[PDB]
Amino acid sequence: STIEEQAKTFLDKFNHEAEDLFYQSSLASWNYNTNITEENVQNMNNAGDKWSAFLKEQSTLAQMYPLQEIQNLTVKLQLQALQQNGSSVLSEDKSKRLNTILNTMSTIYSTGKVCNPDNPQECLLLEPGLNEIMANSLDYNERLWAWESWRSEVGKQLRPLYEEYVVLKNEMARANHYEDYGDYWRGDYEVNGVDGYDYSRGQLIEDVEHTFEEIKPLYEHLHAYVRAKLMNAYPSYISPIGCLPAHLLGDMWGRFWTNLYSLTVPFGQKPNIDVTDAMVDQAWDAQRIFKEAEKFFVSVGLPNMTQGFWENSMLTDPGNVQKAVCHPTAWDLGKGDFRILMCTKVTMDDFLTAHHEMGHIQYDMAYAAQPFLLRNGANEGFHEAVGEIMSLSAATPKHLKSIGLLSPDFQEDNETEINFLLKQALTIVGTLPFTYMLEKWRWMVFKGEIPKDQWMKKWWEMKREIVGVVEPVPHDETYCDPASLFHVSNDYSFIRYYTRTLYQFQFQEALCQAAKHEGPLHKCDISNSTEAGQKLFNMLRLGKSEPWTLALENVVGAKNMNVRPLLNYFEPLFTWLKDQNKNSFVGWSTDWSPY
């Protein structure tokens, strides 16, 4: 007659239906991706609509159940994750307007157009256009023109759309008893109900600020190194006092800086560690790659795959006989069925991606023991970090030599290690300050601390002061600059990448310390240690039943998010940058203007 019995009955009646509908939706999506026809898309859409309707009905039914009388933390968290009203807090007209805005933004942004003047043709899409233009470009004029055309033509037409979007987001946040949308985004990391392990929302911002301030020296040294390399490579193209331009970063959004690796490498005369030629010249395929990955995972301590994983996965491109997507997607079903869909080649990047997907599948099988409302990591960064740490530990030269990818007579030169550290820096830290600045700007624009006529002004002033990137030509207030990304136009967070970057380093440091291995972190081995694997699996099976702070303390030992593994890993590269930048200026000044 109490509320706890009714809540347990509702949960037991809902979990089976939720798992069944999730399995049906996953099967429909798999049949659609593996077979592009006219009926598979309709079946997938019908399954998604039925799942959404059932979830909305169950949420409306569960909203009538209180949350204070229930003392169970797991049931309380499941109800909090299930009773989410979503967009139903607003009116029907506002909801349909928001949906139409989201749909039109998704249709406009996912296509793109170049449309060069005085040329009635060659106006390709986003992927065959600006992507391939800025991929391997070595000219300043064309890069500046592409940047101007991308920020001006697609910057002024999306200003009212983005304004209406942020207004509707603020309205939905204030209607759901939240002060702002950033508060609703940060509430996911907050854990309560556990004494001595709760984490306040205000402490996360302070921890992120402290980590950013501690990373600041490394980022300044990296910026000085990149500026010196650009001055030595492009004379009279970058001032030693001003900031770096935006169109010379090798990326439209400045996420990956791997395009300048071949140009900023000091020891480019040395051969790389690519094992693609060593495998393509012998009898090797994706099957052997996945077998070696499974052997590595079982040597670390991870459980084995099911019989359905090695019979339903399509690890080979069928060709022109049927359309099949080659994008790596972590297919999770939670009902014993697991599969990976990726056209894995015999390269090294595909090997790391396959290791990442196998780590994702291992995490899925780990937390599959929990109900559907708990089959997920503690935060939105652990699910990716569990695979990223394995992909990084598998890329060690010692592991490739033990397997057979690397020749035993290959000498261990420090130049290759320095180049690998520089590449990891350029591909990891090259977007962390931009991520932090974007997250802070979105939080301030959702809270209401930025004037309406100063959005782009504050954006550019933070990009010049906090970040070391400056625009070559100033733009007016009619061009919506921050709306040039994909996550900002599709309602996706951005701090998740930074949290994942911290958590992967934390997990790598924990696994290296548990393995009783000595030396640096870039060559620290994780395999051949069942104790570390068991300690990791004890945390992977927790899911959302326990707070993330206790989960991190059970494996790492720290009470909150830590950043010291990143410094311990980048210490050799930091000392190398300090030694190389002895006769060069470090930092950037906001007084200089390249206009």
Partner: protein
């Protein structure tokens, strides 16, 4: 997924050993008396699991049987298979012809 395998999930009290339930009345969750229909305090306790050929260990169907060995004041009806060796025509041996 198969949905023909029904099962009982919620009951008001524990069952006795070697007992089979026939009545399939709805379960009462709250203090309000259920009038034969579902509601906030009345839910159907009978559900059905889903068995798929792609499910791993823990979700596969397993046929389990229970053998009960009981003895009381009655003649035995089931025994073990008694073996029989090869007889010898003329030799001093020990014999056992049905007891």
């Amino acid at each position: 997924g198969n949905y023909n395998y029904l099962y009982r999930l919620f009951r008001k009290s524990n069952l006795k050993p070697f007992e089979r339930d026939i009545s399939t009345e709805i379960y009462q969750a709250g203090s309000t008396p259920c009038n034969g229909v579902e509601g906030f305090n009345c839910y159907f306790p009978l559900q059905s699991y889903g068995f798929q050929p792609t499910n791993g260990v823990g979700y596969q169907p397993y046929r389990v049987v229970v053998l009960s060995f009981e003895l009381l004041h009655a003649p035995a009806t089931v025994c073990g298979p008694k073996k029989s060796t090869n007889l010898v025509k003329n030799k001093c041996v020990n014999f056992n012809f049905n007891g």
